[PDB]
């Protein structure tokens, strides 16, 4: 049933004294295949991850305990709660919700996260894998007998408890529901709760603006605000952390963690850097192969569960063999070309307005060799400062018009095409230079059916960001314009989205301007940096470009937030609001370390 492999991961292994008896006792070696390799005076043995079978015979016969079995994940046919379609995806197991504490789900993208929340909320129903005459609340509520889910599901059927859920994609909200300025919030389930959230989510915008006027970083806060003022016994927060600022992620966690106390259930899921371990009380992890199946672990405590995902990669259930601490630019390498040829695009400053909001730019240099990162809070208008380029607004009353060609990717998309995405590839040339710009991105992992020729009306929104990036990289330009490139990407493919642009541009000899919240993207891409300051939606200024040590320390100083990084796994971590590390850093003026 489970696949099994022997592992030699023991310190001080001793080919010099053991008489090599693990090699001699193997049946696959007796039948004449090279499953074990060892010889005297070699340091440590080698063992095949694919010729091996799970018998465990060699483990009884090593003179030292140097050898043991691990299981590997497989398509077990056990414990199937739901199947997505005929011959399609299997969800397997389901977690158990508990009152008065926060449960965090974690794992790679597409592995089965949102379908568990839809089942627990009663918006979906389980079907046990039956496609013909599927169960209806009689075999369900009998298949669960002897478990906590039996006494749970009967209460959501009888209206003894009720559920509410934050949307995955918040850009649907201005189309899916409507009201005037202010009124859309005013007529929800309670009055007193609306007055108290004003201290901790920013309600200055919705009393001046229509819902279809809003930015993604307003829509996320509006989605969080409108779920907190409704009445429910169970609440579910799918990604309360996309399109959201480094200071604002902490503010959002605090207003979720206040809901807990009066015997209410809460479930959360994130792809975060440094806040799930402030928000959660327990963790569950999902594993499998995302186009095909997923499975759910037993629950862990916070620090323990984070280490089982991010520093090490095997649970107490004797299984997983995957993640290998992919949380940083772990190699810390640099080896690229230094060149004295250059071209210049230097420009004058301006003053500008998008609304009842003052904006300004100072005069400065721009040149062909470099990538520019832009730093500053949400509501500082900086998406419009990208939109000046390619000439869409105030082209020559300050600034300068581009000499030939510029290419652009927006942070807001709403698709309008038909039949397939395949025909949209006519906008670029693919065969002339296949990697990194396609084969290590669009087709990764596993060359999957989910993307090759689907309609964008059935495609996942996290894959729509990938194909929209891959298309807009295809046309020639001196300058590339990017904002929210990390939206809906997991930690594996965030580093690939950084690699696919920097490994291309640095060998193409070409420029970009890029906008991100996420610290990992910013610190890897930059070579010079731009920083904003002022009052959001009132009065803000864009500064002259700077070197990284001058720029980011002033940005972190303005946030009043400071960072730590660990030598055993390179994970970046936030220091709490007052501490010995916080005062020792802010008296020194250094806000990041070992750089």
């Amino acid at each position: 049933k489970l696949t099994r492999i022997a592992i030699v991961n023991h310190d001080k292994c001793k080919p010099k004294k053991c008489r090599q008896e693990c090699k001699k006792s193997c049946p696959v070696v007796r039948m004449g295949k090279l499953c074990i390799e060892v010889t005297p005076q070699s340091k440590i043995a080698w063992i095949s991850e694919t010729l091996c079978i799970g018998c465990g015979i060699c483990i009884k016969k090593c003179p030292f305990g140097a050898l043991s079995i691990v299981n590997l994940p497989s398509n077990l046919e056990k414990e199937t709660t739901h199947r997505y379609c005929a011959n399609a995806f299997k969800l397997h197991r389901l977690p158990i919700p508990r009152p008065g504490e926060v449960l965090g789900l974690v794992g790679t993208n597409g592995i089965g996260k949102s379908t568990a929340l839809k089942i627990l909320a009663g918006k979906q129903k389980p079907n046990l894998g039956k496609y013909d005459d599927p169960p209806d609340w009689q075999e369900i509520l009998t298949y669960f007998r002897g478990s906590e889910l039996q006494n749970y599901f009967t209460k959501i059927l009888e209206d003894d408890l009720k559920a509410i859920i934050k949307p995955q994609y918040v850009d649907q909200i201005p189309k899916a529901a409507k009201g005037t300025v202010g009124s859309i919030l005013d007529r929800k389930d309670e009055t007193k709760t609306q007055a108290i959230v004003c201290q901790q989510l920013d309600l200055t915008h919705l009393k001046e603006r229509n819902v279809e006027d809003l930015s993604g970083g307003e829509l996320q806060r509006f989605a969080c605000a409108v779920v907190c003022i409704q009445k429910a016994d169970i609440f579910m927060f799918d990604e309360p952390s996309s399109y959201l600022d480094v200071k604002q992620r902490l503010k959002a966690a605090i207003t979720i963690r206040s809901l807990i106390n009066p015997d209410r259930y809460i479930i959360v899921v994130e792809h975060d850097l440094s806040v799930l371990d402030y928000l959660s009380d327990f963790i569950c992890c999902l594993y499998g192969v995302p186009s095909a199946y997923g499975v759910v672990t037993m629950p862990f405590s916070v620090r323990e569960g984070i280490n089982i995902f991010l520093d090490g990669y095997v649970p107490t259930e004797n299984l997983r063999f995957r993640d290998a601490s992919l949380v940083f630019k772990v190699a810390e390498t640099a080896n690229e070309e230094e060149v004295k040829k250059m071209c210049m695009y230097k420009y004058p400053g301006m003053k500008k307005k998008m609304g009842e909001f003052e904006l300004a730019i100072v005069a400065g240099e721009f040149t062909d060799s470099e990538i520019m990162v832009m730093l500053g809070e949400n509501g500082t208008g900086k998406t419009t400062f990208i939109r000046m380029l390619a000439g869409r607004l105030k082209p020559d009353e300050g600034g300068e018009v581009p000499v030939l060609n510029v290419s652009y990717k927006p942070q807001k998309i709403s698709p309008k095409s038909t039949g397939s995405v395949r025909q949209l590839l006519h906008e670029k040339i693919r065969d002339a230079y296949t990697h990194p710009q396609f084969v290590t991105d669009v087709m990764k992992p596993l060359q999957i059916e989910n993307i090759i020729d689907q309609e964008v009306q059935t495609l996942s929104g996290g894959e729509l960001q990938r194909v929209a990036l891959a298309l807009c990289l295809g046309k020639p330009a001196d300058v590339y314009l990017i904002d929210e490139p990390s939206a809906y990407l997991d930690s594996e493919q965030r580093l690939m989205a950084a690699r696919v642009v920097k490994r291309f541009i640095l060998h193409a000899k070409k420029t970009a301007f890029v906008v991100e919240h996420d610290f990992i993207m910013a610190t890897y891409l930059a070579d010079r940096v731009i920083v904003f300051d002022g009052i959001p939606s009132k009065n803000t200024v864009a500064n002259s470009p700077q070197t990284l040590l001058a720029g980011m320390n002033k940005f972190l100083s303005q946030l009043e937030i400071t960072f730590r990084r660990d030598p055993n796994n390179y994970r970046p971590r936030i220091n709490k609001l007052n501490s010995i590390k916080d005062v020792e850093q802010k008296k020194s003026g250094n806000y990041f370390f070992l750089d």
Binding site: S25, V28, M31, I53, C55, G56, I57, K60, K61
Partner: protein, 70 residues
């Protein structure tokens, strides 16, 4: 070769054509031949017989009730 000791055995395969089900490098369940450690009939030096292959019984394979899962 037995799992719990790593020592070596030879075993008989009952019925007409059953050797075609067995393959190589996979698990069998083995049992005694009916005489408490002594050999049986015309077969020289064989003390054991096969009863289960890859978690399916030879009787259920031979009478067509089940098949090897692949």
């Amino acid at each position: 070769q037995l799992i719990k000791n790593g020592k070596k055995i030879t075993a008989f395969v009952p019925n007409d054509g059953c050797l075609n089900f067995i393959e190589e490098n996979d698990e069998v369940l083995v049992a005694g031949f009916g005489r408490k450690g002594h050999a049986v009939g015309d077969i020289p030096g064989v003390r054991f017989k096969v009863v289960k292959v890859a978690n399916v019984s030879l009787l259920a394979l031979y009478k067509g009730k089940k098949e090897r899962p692949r």
